């Protein structure tokens, strides 16, 4: 819902979207809430938010430590949902997507997880260890609760996958920049198949990368490790953290225009 | 879509990032073709026989069952090259890797036994082997880490998470998600995403096949029950597989009970855990009420996989196999008893299976029963552990 | 008078106190009758097969000989229960003990491998086992001492003399000279007074018998040479025996050269010692110019017997077998090389035989030759030793 | 030669012989020479002397330490022969027998060893690890050099052995008191076969034992460990050692009368 409105608006301003990722509760509840408010104020068109998990096997070292730090703070999924409800109460239109690992979604029931997402105002859920092949109950529960199920279009894909990602996905199509963990012509075929707008992610850490993604025909770009690195580098400097974050975001967002 | 069913009832699947699906499909296809290739089978058989030492003996205990109506045989995987059953399937997986044109091997290890098997197979077959091991495990398994290195394998400590087997497992998948083009992930148990549960069972099934031939030759009938410890499920499914269709044969898996199930310090997710999705599969696991993955505690380092293979969860669910648990103290007593009465030093993992067979015998000494315990490995590696414990008592 | 010849040419004999002669005559008689008893042979074969794991594999190296015309096979006594060839003959001797109505076992040990084999056989067959070990050896072989005790054997440190193998040997004979009525002395090598050199050879001869069958099956011809390390001479005579009458087959024994023959710090009495009379036999020994008995130095604890079996001295004297030596450093290099290129960790004793085969290959790489090295044991027990050494370098 | 003369004399005095054993050089050359002179002065009818050897497998702990002590002193076989020549030059008639281990005799040639024995005035040689079965070259060399080869008549023997020990031995027949290491009707059969006079040894440590041996028909008794124990117990008291030695010997010798 919010993604469609955002993409229509951005299209009208001929600009790409810049979407930052951060781990919820990193490095703590309060500071995380402030980090998130800063990202939004600096220009973030949408947010990608991780719920701390014990075994993030799709994340590089930078985000692995993001999770460690959040755990050091005692952040639980229940508390993440309280944070989510508050962020939505503060920002009514910004699209909010969650980055989840399958066990946190399946734990107390898949349907129940997506219902809670709807309740707090989350817009999409990307389950990192659920490939299209195992996605049926997740995408079905997502749709029943007006949540966009986010699918990964890897670089090493094919037509079959492309057609599935296009028919199954909603909100945005996660266009992987490469193989590996967190640290071109696909875009056209996606448009050919009326797929949700493509958002490129993985390795996006500079303004030119954002400009290049939008030029290739992507609706925007996602950046996480580069954002999380600013957090870890300023742990002892809460204020400087926000300032540097503010700087990077505005630069990245500017590249999208 | 796949060539084979990725599920055993509700358990199993391929819960891995989209990027890794091509590697699994490739592996499944290579395996299906290999299983139909007489040349592959001949090569695998040659290595098992002339390099690993198969067939392994089936030893009748002549002292431990005295005074009872139990006849107990031990399937001697402790006599396999490497000192455990692990060697069987690494030879198969290493050959699969070569069939796919892969030149590098990634393995995860906790106790280090699968790590050592992976390294020896890699040295023999010319594969560059890198092994991921939780830093906590590297610290307590200096011997195996050195064996792996003597065999040319790169050992990589994993400090993330709890710095143990599960974290090593995650790291192996992270690596593989970026190097699958040239490297094969040699998973060490009958768990993980399909096709591994299936491949590992098929490459360990000679345990049960030999056991059946051997017991028919020696007793002229099938066992009343075959018993095996269950960490991840490979040695047990290797023993069980060929007997699944022999309905009169009981299949008993023994998970580690650690300090006791009621203490919460155990490694028995099949019977005391809750179904979850992790490590590429839907299966019973050690997890918090929130859904965070926890470690399995056991005096034995090898019964540390915090979940269990999906086929075991399935065989339990339909009542074909029964699962039980044995505590650290019961395993320690079985270890001491086999050393003293049969002159065989069992791995502490295997000691869990032996302890349950001893209980079946002792609880009903006049019940006539023919039992086979899979002796998954030798326990020379556990001598210091047992020593310090007894010395501390 | 005896039933069998106590001498191999000038070497051998029964140089023991008069009081012990009845025990040797009894043992010789029991052995001769056992060798003609189909029931004894069936029992011995059953234990070897179903308990110890015979036959052991004959492994073709596929990497270590690349680039040369040498084809090398390894006879895998490292896969025998216990981890070394020692297990073969202790099973036979334990059965002989029972045939004589003896209930107790005395064994001597240096490295502890024969001690462990004696303890495991004693636990299986219901014999009260006491092992004598030089205190210097007990100190450096805590692992094996603990295995022996876990298996129920009484381990007795010997502080007399140099507190090593020879002193343990003396103590075993002192004990036996007073308890022969109820105890059997399970000597661990092919040396000592007759009948031991003969009994040990006959109870280790399946090594060579299997090797001959296996090589004929695989190559269709006999080896050009069979190679084995020589501490006391049991694993070597076990490999050699069945080939003695095949004159085209070279028999090569490898004594430890330690720091180098010229340093005097070695264990190669057959080729660099002088004939003397000790430990019940006339044979080459490590001795001072005065005639005092000295120790054998080797990085490997098992090549410590300061003399050598009389049949080896005899086979050398007539030119049927050739003996050579390998230094600590050459053995260490062979150890590292087999781990890395074949995925097999060899005992440091066995590494001496492998090192000489490697030299035969490397010195004349275009010489076509089919070689078999007796891999007398596995080297898991030597890992720390090799580790500290390399770490020190 | 000396044994025959001694036994004829003792028979005339209806007394048994008392023969002590000590290790040469224990605890040193000089003190050993003094110990030996004391034993003779106290009543010893003959001497049994050990040449220090590395592996005395027929000796219990007491004598094993006797050897250790001598080695601690640097005592060599060559030095033992110098001690032997001097003891003979001092005492012309006392029978002197050596207790040897086979390697010391075989080392530089069997014939040469017995020739050296003759040269210094030794009367007999007992090679502990040479049974009658392996005795031919030793007894032949002994006889060629007028040395008595001493044979062991174990308690667990038989007629065959008895006849061999009787025809092969000279000087005295060593009648073992038991099985084991250092720490009746046989006697008659020996006389029946014209064997050299029997001397009982092993475990002889009291006067009554000496009286009992002579009463059983033995020509005398040998005692070693009991003697060596007096040495080890007075290491720090050289003089007291001699006194205690003197006491034990005289008592034991008295029992023989
Ligand atoms: C002798 C022996 N018996 C049993 C097991 C349990 O595994 P399984 O259930 O797969 O058979 C192991 C496991 N070992 C694993 C897990 O730590 C390893 O990385 O070495 C073992 O080493
Ligand atoms: C693996 C292995 N290979 C070789 C040898 C050498 O003895 P052998 O020459 O009798 O074969 C030994 C000896 N081991 C003896 C002597 O110390 C023991 O008491 O254990 C061994 O343990
Ligand atoms: O800038 P980077 O490289 O740190 O990338 C951003 C990471 N955060 S995220 O939510 O997009 C993200 C989304 C999906 C992921 O795994 C999957 F692809 F397997 F599904 C991992 C991270
Ligand atoms: O009084 P004990 O018990 O110490 O006995 C005296 C010991 N000294 S000895 O020369 O007689 C002596 C003589 C022969 C020996 O060994 C053999 F019998 F095998 F030949 C051992 C000691
Ligand atoms: Na488990
Ligand atoms: Na030797």
CA distance B132 to C72: 34
Question: Residue C101: left if φ>0, alpha if ψ -120 to 50, beta else—which one?
Answer: left
Asked whether the beta carbons of A137 and A185 are under 8 A apart, the reply is no
| Structure tokens, D12 | 């005339």
CA distance C267 to C201: 21
Cα first-last separation, chain C = 56
Q: Is B88 helix (H, G, I), strand (E, B) or coil?
A: helix
Helix (H) or strand (E) holding D39: helix D29-41
If you search the block for the tokens 């490995």, which residue do you land on? B377
Cα three-residue angle A214-A220-A226, rounded to 5 degrees: 110
DSSP one-letter code for B137:
H
Reduce the secondary structure of chain C to three states and give it as a string: CCCCCCEECCEEEEECCHHHHHHHHHHHHHHHHHHCCHHHHHHHHHHHHHHHCCCCCEEECCCCCCCCCEEEEEEEHHHCCCCECHHHHHHHHHHHHHHCCCCEEEEEECCCHHHHHHHHHHHHHCCEEEEEEEHHHHHHCHHHHHHHHHCCCEEEEECCCCCCHHHHHHHHHHHHHHHCCCEEECCCCCCCCCCHHHHHHHCCCHHHHHHHHHHHHHHCCCCCEEEEECCCCHHHHHHHHHHCCCCCCEEEEEEEEECEHHHCECCCHHHHCEEEEECEEEEEECECCCCCECCCCCCCHHHCCCCCCHHHHHHHHCCCEEEEEEEHHHHHHHHHHHHHHHCCCECHHHHHHHHHHHHHHHHCCCCCEEEEEEECEECHHHHHHHHHHHHHC
Residue A144: count other Cβ atoms within 10 Å of its Cβ. Answer: 12
CA distance B368 to B221: 14
CA distance C116 to C378: 14
Q: DSSP E strands: which ranges in D60-202?
A: 96-100, 124-127, 148-149, 152-153, 173-176, 198-201
* Whole-number CA gyration radius for chain B: 19
B66 exposed, middle or buried (CB, 10 Å; 0-12, 13-18, 19+)? exposed
D19: Cβ–Cβ under 8 A, 6 or more apart, which residues? D44, D45, D46, D47, D48, D97, D199, D220, D221, D222, D223
Q: What is the least distance, in Å, from the CA of D135 to any CA of chain C?
A: 9
| Structure tokens, B323 | 């699962």
Residue B344 backbone dihedrals phi, psi, to 5 degrees: -120, 130
Q: Is B364 helix (H, G, I), strand (E, B) or coil?
A: coil
Q: Give the dihedral of Cα atoms D166, D171, D177, D181; nearest 10 deg.
A: -110
C-alpha to C-alpha distances, D231 to A241, B50, D237, nearest whole angstrom? 88, 64, 9
B182: Cβ–Cβ under 8 A, 6 or more apart, which residues? B102, B103, B104
Is A48 an active-site residue? yes
Asked whether the beta carbons of B348 and B336 are under 8 A apart, the reply is no
Nearest CA to ligand 3 atom 11: A201
Q: Is B73 helix (H, G, I), strand (E, B) or coil?
A: strand
* Whole-number CA gyration radius for chain D: 17
**Total domain count for chain A?**
1
CA distance C182 to C198: 23
| Structure tokens, C154 | 């009484």
Give helix A77-90 / helix A29-41 axis angle, nearest 10°. Answer: 40
A154 interface with B at CB cutoff 8 Å: yes
Strands C154-158 and A198-201: unpaired
| Structure tokens, B1 | 């879509």
Residues of A in contact with B178 (CB under 8 A): 179-181
Helix (H) or strand (E) holding B250: strand B250-258
CA distance D77 to D104: 8
C-alpha to C-alpha distances, C92 to A22, C28, C88, C97, nearest whole angstrom? 71, 13, 7, 9
Mutate to test the pocket of ligand 3, among A99, A150, A157, A161 (most ligand atoms within 8 A of CB): A99
Cα first-last separation, chain A = 23
CA distance A205 to B265: 44
Cα three-residue angle C115-C118-C122, rounded to 5 degrees: 140
Q: Pocket residues for ligand 1 (CB within 6 Å)?
A: B 84, 86, 109-115, 165, 188-189, 229-236, 301-305, 347, 349-350, 376-377
B342-351 per-residue burial string, b: 16 or more CB within 10 A, e: under 16: bbbbbbbbbb
* Whole-number CA gyration radius for chain A: 17
Residues forming beta bridges with residue C132, ordered by sequence position: C108, C156
Q: How many CA atoms lie within 13 A of C88 on its CB side?
A: 30
CA distance C12 to C24: 14
CA distance A173 to A195: 7
B151 interface with C at CB cutoff 8 Å: yes
Q: Give the dihedral of Cα atoms C354, C358, C361, C364; nearest 10 deg.
A: -130
CA distance A211 to B317: 54
Torsion over CA: B384, B388, B391, B393 (sign): negative
B152: Cβ–Cβ under 8 A, 6 or more apart, which residues? B119, B122, B123, B129, C339, C340
Residues of B with catalytic function: 61, 85
Torsion over CA: B258, B260, B261, B262 (sign): negative
CA distance C150 to B335: 9
CA distance B321 to B240: 9
CA distance D197 to A157: 106
CATH for A126: 3.20.20.70
Cα three-residue angle B90-B110-B87, rounded to 5 degrees: 20
Can you spell out the DSSP letters for chain A? -HHHHHHHHHHHTT--EEEEEEETTSS-HHHHHHHHHHHHHTT-SSEEEEPP-S--TTB-HHHHHHHHHHHHTT--HHHHHHHHHHHHHH-SSS-EEEEE-HHHHHTT-HHHHHHHHHHHT--EEEETT--GGG-HHHHHHHHHTT-EEP-EE-SS--HHHHHHHHHH--S-EEEESSSS-B--HHHHHHHHTT-S-EEEESS--SHHHHHHHHHTT-SEEEE-HHHHHHHHHTTT-HHHHHHHHHHHHHHHHHHH-
Cα three-residue angle B218-B221-B222, rounded to 5 degrees: 105
* Cβ contact, residue pair B79, C83, below 8 Å: no
Residues forming beta bridges with residue A67, ordered by sequence position: none
CA distance D94 to B67: 68
Strands C280-285 and C11-15: antiparallel
Strands B321-327 and B280-285: unpaired
Residue C378 backbone dihedrals phi, psi, to 5 degrees: -85, 160
Residue C54: count other Cβ atoms within 10 Å of its Cβ. Answer: 21
C20-47 per-residue burial string, b: 16 or more CB within 10 A, e: under 16: bbbbbbebbebbbebeeeeebeebbeeb
C-alpha to C-alpha distances, C186 to C111, C308, D204, nearest whole angstrom? 15, 17, 32
CA distance C321 to C315: 5
CA distance C18 to D157: 9
DSSP one-letter code for B57:
P
Q: Which of C378, C338, C343 is nearest to B90 (CA)?
A: C343
Nearest CA to ligand 2 atom 15: C302
CA distance C182 to C197: 22
Residue C133 backbone dihedrals phi, psi, to 5 degrees: -140, 135
CA distance C232 to D118: 37
CA distance B179 to B165: 21
* Cβ contact, residue pair C160, D151, below 8 Å: no
Does an interface of 3+ CB pairs under 8 Å exist between C and B? yes
CA distance A21 to A245: 12
The C residues from 272 to 331 touching D (CB cutoff 8 Å) are 276-280, 282, 287, 290-294
Residue B376 backbone dihedrals phi, psi, to 5 degrees: -55, -30
CA distance D28 to D18: 24
Spacing, Cα D181 to ligand 4 middle (Å) = 7
Asked whether the beta carbons of D16 and D210 are under 8 A apart, the reply is yes
DSSP one-letter code for D52:
P
| Structure tokens, A165 | 């990602």
D124 exposed, middle or buried (CB, 10 Å; 0-12, 13-18, 19+)? buried
B186-200 per-residue burial string, b: 16 or more CB within 10 A, e: under 16: bbbbbbbbbbbbbbb
Asked whether the beta carbons of C308 and C191 are under 8 A apart, the reply is yes
Residues forming beta bridges with residue B15, ordered by sequence position: B280
- Laid out side by side, the sheet with B183-185 consists of B154-158, B128-134, B104-109, B183-185
Torsion over CA: A83, A86, A90, A95 (sign): positive
Residue C33 backbone dihedrals phi, psi, to 5 degrees: -70, -40
Determination method here? X-ray
Residues of B in contact with A128 (CB under 8 A): 17
Residues forming beta bridges with residue C326, ordered by sequence position: C256
Spacing of C-alpha D85 from chain mean position: 17
CA distance A180 to B178: 4
Asked whether the beta carbons of B259 and B265 are under 8 A apart, the reply is yes
The per-type count for chain B, helices as H runs and strands as E runs, is 15, 14
Cis status, amide bond into A27, omega within 30 of 0: yes
If you search the block for the tokens 């944070």, which residue do you land on? A83
Strands C183-185 and B250-258: unpaired
Measured over all CA atoms, what is the biggest interatomic distance in chain D, rounded to whole angstroms? 49
CA distance B80 to B88: 8
Q: Which domains does chain B have, with CATH numbers?
A: 8-52+86-204 (3.40.50.1100), 53-85+205-390 (3.40.50.1100)
Asked whether the beta carbons of C370 and C221 are under 8 A apart, the reply is yes
Q: Which of C119, C135, C50 is nearest to C86 (CA)?
A: C119
D6: Cβ–Cβ under 8 A, 6 or more apart, which residues? D17, D45, D46, D93, D95
Composition of chain D by helix, strand, coil, percent to 5: 50, 15, 35
Residues forming beta bridges with residue B278, ordered by sequence position: B281
Cis status, amide bond into B330, omega within 30 of 0: no
DSSP one-letter code for B324:
E
Residue B245 backbone dihedrals phi, psi, to 5 degrees: -85, 0
Torsion over CA: B276, B278, B282, B283 (sign): negative
Q: Is D15 in the pocket of ligand 4 (CB under 6 A)?
A: no
Asked whether the beta carbons of B102 and B184 are under 8 A apart, the reply is yes
Cis status, amide bond into C55, omega within 30 of 0: yes
Q: Which of D119, D130, D123, D112 is nearest to D196 (CA)?
A: D123
Asked whether the beta carbons of B316 and B270 are under 8 A apart, the reply is yes
Residue D122 backbone dihedrals phi, psi, to 5 degrees: -70, 145
If you search the block for the tokens 């998130």, which residue do you land on? A36
Cα first-last separation, chain B = 56
**Domain residue limits at A122:** 1-257
Asked whether the beta carbons of A126 and A99 are under 8 A apart, the reply is yes
CA distance D219 to C129: 42
If you search the block for the tokens 């009818």, which residue do you land on? D45
- Laid out side by side, the sheet with C225-229 consists of C58-60, C70-76, C369-375, C225-229, C250-258, C321-327
The H-assigned helical ranges of chain B are 21-35, 38-47, 86-99, 113-125, 135-140, 142-150, 165-179, 196-202, 206-219, 234-240, 269-272, 310-317, 328-342, 348-363, 383-392
Asked whether the beta carbons of C197 and C8 are under 8 A apart, the reply is yes
Q: Is B107 helix (H, G, I), strand (E, B) or coil?
A: strand
CA distance C346 to C333: 11
Nearest CA in chain D to C23: D156
Asked whether the beta carbons of D151 and D173 are under 8 A apart, the reply is yes
CA distance D56 to D227: 18
Helix (H) or strand (E) holding D88: helix D77-90
CA distance C272 to A250: 85
Spacing of C-alpha C158 from chain mean position: 21
C256: Cβ–Cβ under 8 A, 6 or more apart, which residues? C229, C231, C266, C267, C268, C296, C297, C298, C299, C300, C303, C325, C326, C327, C328, C331, C352
């Amino acid at each position: 819902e919010r993604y469609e409105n955002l993409f229509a608006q951005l299209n009208d301003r001929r600009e790409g979207a810049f979407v930052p990722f951060v781990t919820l509760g990193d490095p703590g509840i309060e500071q995380s809430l402030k980090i998130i408010d800063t990202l939004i104020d600096a220009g973030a068109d949408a947010l990608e938010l991780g719920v701390p998990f014990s075994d993030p096997l799709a994340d590089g070292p930078t985000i692995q430590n993001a999770n460690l730090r959040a755990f050091a703070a005692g952040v639980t999924p229940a508390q993440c949902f309280e944070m989510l409800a508050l962020i939505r109460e503060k920002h009514p239109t910004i699209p909010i997507g969650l980055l989840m690992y399958a066990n946190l979604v399946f734990n107390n029931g898949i349907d129940a997880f997506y219902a809670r997402c709807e309740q707090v105002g989350v817009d999409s859920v990307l389950v990192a260890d659920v490939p299209v092949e195992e996605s049926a109950p997740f995408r079905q529960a997502a749709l029943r609760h007006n949540i966009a199920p986010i699918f990964i279009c890897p670089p090493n894909a094919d037509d079959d996958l492309l057609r599935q990602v296009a028919s199954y996905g909603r909100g945005y199509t996660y266009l992987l920049s490469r193989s590996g963990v967190t640290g071109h012509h696909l875009i056209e075929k996606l448009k050919e198949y009326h797929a949700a707008p493509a958002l490129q992610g993985f390795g996006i850490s500079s303004p030119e990368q954002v400009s290049a993604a939008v030029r290739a025909g992507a609706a925007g770009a996602i950046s996480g490790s580069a954002i999380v690195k600013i957090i870890e580098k300023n742990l002892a400097s809460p204020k400087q953290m926000l300032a540097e974050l503010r700087s990077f975001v505005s630069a990245m967002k500017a590249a999208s225009r | 879509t796949t060539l084979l069913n990725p599920y055993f009832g509700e358990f199993g699947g391929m819960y891995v990032p989209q990027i890794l699906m091509p590697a699994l499909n490739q592996l499944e296809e290579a395996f299906v073709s290999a299983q139909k290739d007489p040349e592959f089978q001949a090569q695998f058989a040659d290595l098992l026989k002339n390099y690993a030492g198969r067939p392994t003996a089936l030893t009748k205990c002549q002292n431990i069952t005295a005074g009872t109506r139990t006849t107990l045989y031990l399937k001697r995987e402790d006599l396999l090259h490497g000192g455990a059953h692990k060697t069987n399937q690494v030879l198969g997986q290493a050959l699969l890797a070569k069939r796919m044109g892969k030149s590098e091997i990634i393995a995860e290890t906790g106790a280090g036994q699968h790590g050592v098997a992976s390294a020896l197979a890699s040295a023999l077959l010319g594969l560059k082997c890198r092994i991921y091991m939780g830093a906590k495990d590297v610290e307590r398994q200096s011997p195996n880490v050195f064996r792996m290195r003597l065999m040319g394998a790169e050992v990589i400590p994993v400090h993330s998470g709890s710095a143990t087997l599960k974290d090593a497992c995650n790291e192996a998948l992270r690596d593989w998600s970026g190097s699958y083009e040239t490297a094969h992930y040699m998973l060490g148990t009958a768990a993980g995403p399909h096709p591994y549960p299936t491949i590992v069972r098929e490459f360990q099934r000679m345990i049960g096949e030999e056991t059946k031939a051997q017991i028919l030759d020696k007793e002229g009938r099938l066992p009343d029950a075959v018993i095996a410890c269950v960490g991840g499920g490979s040695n047990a499914i290797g023993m069980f597989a060929d007997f699944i269709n022999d309905t009169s044969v009981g299949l008993i898996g023994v998970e580690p009970g650690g300090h006791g199930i009621e203490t919460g310090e155990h490694g028995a997710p099949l019977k005391h855990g809750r179904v979850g999705i992790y490590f590429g599969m839907k299966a019973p696991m050690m997890q918090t009420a929130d859904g965070q993955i926890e470690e399995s505690y056991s005096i034995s380092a090898g019964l540390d996989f915090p979940s269990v293979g999906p086929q075991h969860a399935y065989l339990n669910s339909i009542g074909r196999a029964d699962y039980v648990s044995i505590t650290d103290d019961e395993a320690l007593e079985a270890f001491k008893t086999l050393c003293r009465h049969e002159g065989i030093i069992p791995a502490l993992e295997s000691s869990h299976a032996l302890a349950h067979a001893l209980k079946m015998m002792r609880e009903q000494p006049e019940k006539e029963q023919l039992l086979v315990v899979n002796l998954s490995g030798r326990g020379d590696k556990d001598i210091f552990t047992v020593h310090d414990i007894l010395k501390a008592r």
